[PDB]
Amino acid sequence: MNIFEMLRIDEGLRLKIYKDTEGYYTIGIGHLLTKSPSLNAAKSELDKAIGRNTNGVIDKDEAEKLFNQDVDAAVRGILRNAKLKPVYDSLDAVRRAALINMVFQMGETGVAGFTNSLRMLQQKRWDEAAVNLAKSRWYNQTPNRAKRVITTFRTGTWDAYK
């Protein structure tokens, strides 16, 4: 298992614009298009992102290309973030995947806001961090996905995904 396979399990793959769990216009592998309510603003962003007139639909390769950029952007965002970088540096390879996952889903800013949990992760207090991470809107909104990520942080194994 690796970060790509993990996020592909968590986000799925859709070749037509869809709305995410929060109601936003998305396409491919969790690629957020816009927070605007307009399908047109969504189609425009999509065409901008792909470099072609898509009429809201893309092929698998296009989906995967966006996905590669997003994972890359995620990792680089973590490494440029003064609050996140130290956490990441401290972690083993599996747990690093868990943090990248959170950042892909909720952006750097959002994760950077989990002050207490980040400190607990840094100190390698697994059980405590797992309990703290569960007291969040995130967990209440996407309980199944949150549980998988959290289990990954607690255990440091890919069990939740097997």
**Contact footprint for Cl ion (CB under 5 A):** 49, 142, 144-145
Continuous segment of H or E residues that includes residue 14:
strand 14-19
Residues annotated in a binding site for substrate: 32, 104, 117, 132
Active site residue 11: yes
Find, among 148, 108, 130, 118, the residue nearest to 7 by Cα.
148
> Is residue 75 a contact partner of residue 100, using CB atoms and an 8 Å limit?
yes
CB 56 to Cl ion: min, Å: 16
CB 47 to Cl ion: min, Å: 11
C-alpha to C-alpha distances, 57 to 11, 19, 20, nearest whole angstrom: 17, 14, 16
Active site residue 159: no
Q: Single out the catalytic residue among 5, 10, 11, 64.
A: 11
Using DSSP bridges, classify how beta strands 14-19 and 31-34 pair: parallel, antiparallel or unpaired: unpaired
* Residue closer to Cl ion (CB basis): 28 or 132: 28
* Residue closer to Cl ion (CB basis): 77 or 87: 77
- Is 152 in a helix, a strand, or coil? helix
CB 90 to Cl ion: min, Å: 27
What are phi and psi for residue 145, nearest 5 degrees? -65, -50
In DSSP terms, 28 is beta-bridged to 14
* Residue closer to Cl ion (CB basis): 122 or 158: 158
Residues annotated in a binding site: 32, 104, 117, 132
Q: Single out the catalytic residue among 5, 10, 20, 62.
A: 20
The residues assigned a catalytic role are 11, 20
